[PDB]
């Protein structure tokens, strides 16, 4: 008898005996869990590291929420399904074109092309613009997908996301978007649907909204991970397979004084090339943000044409701070990003710092706590934990957070 499998962007899928389940962990630096089992906070999680398959796999850069979740649901990078970061810059027309709606989605996930093939799919994020993205290709009506958001769980509707109000059906209070329980809702939600639902696919989401706030190892960011061990106990207890990974990684982004580290690009650029010659893009988050929610480890900009790239390029690279820069071609065969919503250059800095644009009219920060961050090779490392025997399951830098899938399916099988 031939084996059944679901072939999704080049890569064989085998069929799920029992349900296969994907947990992001976002922003889950390895040294949270580390903490966090180090204090006697997840048992279920110690002993699944203990009796399963433990590694460190690698994400894609920039290590950014959206293009490692869309990696994720594709099993490819963003060279293969389109989403690099929250936004572009268009040169013609001067437009900063949002990059997060399902219609810039280039390659269909593994659940459209697993529920294309008959099977019980579910979707849970803790952000609906992320669930939509997600979401594409999905069906409602046959009862074989659910996808929604903690966000938005009481909009929920049969038709559009297979479930009528996920906060009445759970019985949990729609939460606030910048809290712990926003991420809680979507363990709670996974483990109500594993029972009565039986996905044989299953994809769970969250933010990094603890992380960005708490180093590892400090009280508020332990039980945040005592409460997701919970959750997975009952998930693993259910027979589940189970791979947790992570988006992207986390790490400290200030000065000793605990103010933001920033290298300020659009302003070298302004001195080097003319004002507003280059323009510089942050895609760590939606381009309207001013307030350090905005400053991240990765950015690229777009150049005036005819001007020297390579002389450009020396002269970023010559900064203290400033890691990598790369020109297009090369930034997207080694990073895997397609050239076509990508700038000139890209820049990654060092592990403390970060790339902002100007202090013209300046980059006001938000929030009081010294400043957590991703977007750059240093959050590039995340946890990769399978609730099964695999000795043949790689290591980073060659097993991928996006493999996540392509190996829950074959522990599940
Ligand atoms: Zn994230
Ligand atoms: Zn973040």
Redesign the pocket.
Known sequence: MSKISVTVNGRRYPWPRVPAIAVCL??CEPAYLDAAIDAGLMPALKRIKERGAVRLAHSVIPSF?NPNNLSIATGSPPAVHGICGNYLYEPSTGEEVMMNDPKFLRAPTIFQAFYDAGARVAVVTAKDKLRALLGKGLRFDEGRAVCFSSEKSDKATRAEHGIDNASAWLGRPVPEVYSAALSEFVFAAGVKLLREFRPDIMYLTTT?YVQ?KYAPGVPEANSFYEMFDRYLAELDGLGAAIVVTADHGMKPKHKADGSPDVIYVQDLLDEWLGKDAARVILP?TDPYVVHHGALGSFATAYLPDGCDRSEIMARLKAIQGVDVVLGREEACRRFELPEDRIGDIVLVSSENKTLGTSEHRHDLAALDEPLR??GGLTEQEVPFIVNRVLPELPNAPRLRNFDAFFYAVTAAA
């Open positions: 976002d922003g929420t990094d960005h760590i961050s991703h």
